[model samples]
Target: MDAEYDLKFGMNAGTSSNEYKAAEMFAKEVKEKSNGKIEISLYPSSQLGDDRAMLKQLKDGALDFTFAESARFQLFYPEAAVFALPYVITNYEVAQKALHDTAFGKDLIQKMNKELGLTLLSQAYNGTRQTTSNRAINGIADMKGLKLRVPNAATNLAYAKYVGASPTPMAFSEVYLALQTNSVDGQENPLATVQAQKFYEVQKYLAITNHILNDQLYLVSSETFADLPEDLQKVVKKAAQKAAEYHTKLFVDGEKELVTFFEKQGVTVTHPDLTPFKDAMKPYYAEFVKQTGAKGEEVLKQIQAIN
Candidate 1:
């Protein structure tokens, strides 16, 4: 394979996870389209480093590409905090429109490139966030004082705190053991993630909170991306776009499939009333509006307009 450019692609999911599989699809498409002139090596499970460190490595030109959750992405582009909003973008039906195919998604790509020098290709529908615990989480009231493992993003942490859980910010790699050793009472993640990380074995309850529809984005350093010729850039974009769509379908459907899978394993699944959780997050809405200014309000309006 006469590859002219070789790249390193890393993420926190297992090699078999949909995200990693999408990376593999993306690499294959890029290699085939570029006629083996571009090669991307897949590194799952922080072979390079965790997502936090990988962000710096990409910005510093030490890495070529990586997947980042919307929450962490929001730390850099405050506008991305929209994705972190609890129960805002609910199902894939609305998410596909508000997040993936709309002008909003295109605008965010441009903003990332302009502000952070990161070329964000597109967003993939990664499944809604669900709550899991060893104890019953029947409703919002049940969450009080329940130690919850949350991502470092403010919106999620705020949601956890607002709902009365002592939010413990921890990395994905450390979450499995934390739950196993009872270091934390619970953790929230996608159904696919719980299955991939095998959290079902360590925990007993699966609450389908669907609080946040966590979409994942693949990004390349602007410097590295700029180095590519126009044709190569086109090939990369086409490949990433196709692969993202592929992952989206699998991810959304896999969520439902995982619920059944978890059930056969004896995990108690609860479909809690979302109104309470949504109301709890309502107070935090103004905070996001302030953080992203009028743009936040505009996008939130657009997102709500979607079915």
Candidate 2:
């Protein structure tokens, strides 16, 4: 054995997806920034496994790092669910800013690290999630009875139900086939996804619902983090932070390009009034508070109170 620390990271690929690009960038930056001392080898496109599986690997020390959505983290750290609440944060910038800059966000990360044995590196933006369906959805009424594919997260499932759809929980890799076979009438994701997976080809309608502005958190195994020298630890953390900032910028800037690309492909794109969705989701906040407890409730209040 070489007796040297090798950082192994897992995320989706570098084709067109933001997660892939971010992972590639982070791997490059970490390798260069550390002068090759702390090598970051990346396994993209679920090569290691799905996000949830990768997260489990991180927790069990079988993996070093992963850039996973907030919802997935909630499985290990229940408080993380607060960050993914429906309609809580309106835009990617707001959600990213509030989460990365607020005391509550800091506390949440600290709690995860201390209590759950994980290290929160940074909070990154995943872009506004949009709805793509088999039928034209010019309004909420069009969502009725549509079997929509959502992440395997309670918040997502609830949001789909509120919008009058039957929520189907399936893996991201399986979505394309599901849509083609009529197994799922629709799926929600950022525009980047619509373009990446060619969902526009199968789905007749594309709407910018912005239902849940999901943000992803970069994390590492606490066991691995603690084993590093203090200076190396700081370098690793800084590298992750810088990588997150870069990825956020890329996603924000790339949104328009993604939308335009999908539109050019003959996808009927529409931006529906979000007010109705927001109003409908207001009651769910209380349910969120109940399901997540005091910390979750307080964090929700703080997020809402943010300007």
Candidate 3:
């Protein structure tokens, strides 16, 4: 009889996040299925480090699991940035199709394994992004000249610029005070995040722009995977897939219900017509092709054809 394997999973997600809940679900399943041979310890809210740091830990076999997406892959592979392009994936269904059914995704996944030594277990819908502001945003014109807080990401910065808002790149932790003090006029995030972080308390308008659909990737270190027996590897893979489905459901239900919740908080919810907003991204998409070249164009075309 050999000693049991105790795996460590690290995530930047807060304890209240659906991602954390799904991580817990994964741990439970792996433990039960392995019948005490495998146990998972979860470190939420960046106890080990941020996503990038944890990913580095995984590459060194210092961590067993972590989460990331194509946007996170931007540092390594520029073409993968297409996955996070604003309004391109449209919704979770299309995102899934692009990931599972496209040659781009297949090739990218293989490269991640071959070059980066990371094994992707499954994909979960993170959430669709919405805009929250101190001022009313009734239409696309309202976006003009608005100061919008965005993460230091190329795609998000482009989202703000193309839509006529001046993008202010800031750290996530500094956003609430920035909004309260009027440092930035508004910010964008998933509805669940706006609620969790109490952004509604300071923001008066909730605009349903549905700008970006994010997918969370479940990844394990290849070094860890190589050491695991085939039986345990199968168990982990099955559990991660099951956890991803549950995680997607949580985000879907949250998105459906949070609009009313925001309204109840006295935040005026507006559903501006999204056509013009989508049209605004054309130039940005062209820029993406310029940066990524032929390989990117092929992937972009495949995603656009998904739905």
Candidate 4:
């Protein structure tokens, strides 16, 4: 059979990550469903640059598919930053509802297509951000003066600052070594990520900061989608939905199981009181609204209102 579209699917995550596993599932599903009319090849570990660059490549028709978080979308649509606000999304279920069941979410999807030339195929729960440090973080007070490695994102930076940690922005690939060498005292990411990246080895303690709940979007370049016939498009969409569901399950199960895995590795895990952590983010939330104005406030309110 002739191939209608042969595509590239890039990701920032490594092969050990659930994101890459789900993408593999998606690729197989699409090819089988489309009867070889559509083919998708995988590129993991930032070979096609970071998420931001991958997103841009999609717009330029230089790439076909990739995964991205709402915080990444914030670079183009600033109000999307609301999704990244610390402790606001609550959990994967709430994050899904807030993204698919709200008016703001509906419009945001449209904006991705109309303005950015990308179609959001589906969303999967990545995981909640937690802290790992060389020194134990017993409570909120322990964060003070601690050098915390964060991604180059406004929300993450604010998370470290408000909690009284010194925020050090670093690339993902360098984090493990940075922690090992004490270049930065600690870093924060999802439990699954800590396992995938082997951060548990370099760090002594895992603190359940739950500062952010990440939902990664399955994005297809609109240019590539336009090239597909209607039936093949359906094949892509349906495969994406299935893959996202599996993607979410992987993280949900990882979150439930990884604590013991960390302990077996001799990594001490701590559950700090979350009340003060949530309280500290209030001012930063205000600042988000102040910068993005009414739209940000409304989106944030709608997300929080979800039961």
Q: Which ten residues in a row have the lowest lDDT in candidate 2?
A: 11-20
Ranking of predictions according to lDDT: 4, 3, 1, 2
The TM-score of candidate 4 is 0.97
After superposing candidate 2 on the true structure, give the runs of residues whose Cα lies further than 4 Å from its correct spot. Answer: 1-3, 12-15, 76-79, 100-103, 293-296
Q: What residue runs in model 1 are displaced by over 4 Å at the alpha carbon?
A: 96-107, 287-299, 305-307
- Where's the lowest-lDDT run of ten residues in candidate 4? 69-78
Better of 1 and 3 by lDDT: 3
lDDT of 4 by residue, 1-307 (tens): 8777879999889999999999999999999999988889999988988888888999999899999886677887788888888988887788788778999888888898999999999999999999999889999999999999999888899999999999999778678789888989999999999999999889989999999989999999999998888988899999999999999999998989999999999999999999999999999988888999988988888887899
Which pairs clash (backbone N, Cα, C closer than 3 Å) in model 4?
none
Q: Pick the candidate with the highest TM-score.
A: 4
- Superior candidate under lDDT, 2 versus 3: 3
Q: Specify the highest-lDDT model's number.
A: 4
- Residue 297, model 3: lDDT of 89
Question: Cα lDDT of all candidates, in order?
Answer: 0.84, 0.79, 0.89, 0.91
Residue 300's C-alpha lDDT in candidate 1? 84
CA error at residue 210 for candidate 1, angstroms: 0.7
Give one digit per residue, the lDDT tens place, for model 1 in 1-307. 5789999888988976889889999999999999999999988987787888887888788899988865566776677677778877766667556655667766766766777667877678888889999899888999999999986668878879878899999877888899999989999988888888899999999998888877778889888999999999999999999999998988878965888899999999998897898888877897778878988888888887776
User: Which wins on lDDT, candidate 2 or candidate 4?
Assistant: 4
lDDT of 3 by residue, 194-222 (tens): 88778998999999999988899999999
